[PDB]
Amino acid sequence: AGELERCFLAMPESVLPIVTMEERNDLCRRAGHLSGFTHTASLESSLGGTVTFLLNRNFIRIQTSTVGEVFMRILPFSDSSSVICVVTTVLHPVADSRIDFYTTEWKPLKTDRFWQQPRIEDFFLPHTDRQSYAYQAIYASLTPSYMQVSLSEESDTLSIRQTVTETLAEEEKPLAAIFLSPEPLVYRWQSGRFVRQ
Numbered sequence: 001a002g003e004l005e006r007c008f009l010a011m012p013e014s015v016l017p018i019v020t021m022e023e024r025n026d027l028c029r030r031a032g033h034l035s036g037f038t039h040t041a042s043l044e045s046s047l048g049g050t051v052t053f054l055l056n057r058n059f060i061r062i063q064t065s066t067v068g069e070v071f072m073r074i075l076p077f078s079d080s081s082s083v084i085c086v087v088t089t090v091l092h093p094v095a096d097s098r099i100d101f102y103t104t105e106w107k108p109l110k111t112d113r114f115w116q117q118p119r120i121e122d123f124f125l126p127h128t129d130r131q132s133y134a135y136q137a138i139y140a141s142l143t144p145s146y147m148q149v150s151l152s153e154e155s156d157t158l159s160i161r162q163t164v165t166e167t168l169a170e171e172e173k174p175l176a177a178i179f180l181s182p183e184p185l186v187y188r189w190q191s192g193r194f195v196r197q
Contacts, residue, residue: 005034097149120145134175156189
């Protein structure tokens with residue numbers, strides 16, 4: 001077993017009670033060791049709710065009916081040690097992610113150390129005028145600044161997209177379009193933290 005598999009098997013139920021400990025360790029038993037070939041499984045949990053799993057040696061992606069998507073991976077803290085990065089994304093009513101960090105023994109770490117959430121202005125197009133009619137009309141709709149994160153399956157990188165634009169009324173979208181960009185921002189894990197690329 002790889003390190004992610006080890007951590008997943010020993011994750012306390014209370015840390016992520018999507019399935020019971022026994023359901024989890026029985027799922028993994030039927031899976032056998034996690035490899036480069038993603039293993040798909042689905043379960044109706046005794047806890048309530050259907051859960052699907054993608055189990056790979058380098059990432060686990062879970063879909064739930066309650067908390068949304070949970071995506072987790074190991075990231076190198078040094079060349080000898082690791083931390084667990086878990087990205088949990090509600091998909092409705094508007095896609096919005098939380099990034100959590102843990103030690104490999106499931107001790108919670110303060111996220112600020114590894115990740116700084118971008119401001120909505122980071123998603124602005126060039127030459128944005130903060131006194132423009134368009135900006136002033138949309139300003140109050142820019143917050144809550146929902147953002148959806150996708151951590152890569154295969155490199156130590158992530159992309160984050162603002163999901164404010166989809167929240168706007170149809171008559172607002174043309175005003176927002178002059179300054180609010182749908183292009184995702186990319187970050188790379190470099191020496192124990194995410195850095196904007």
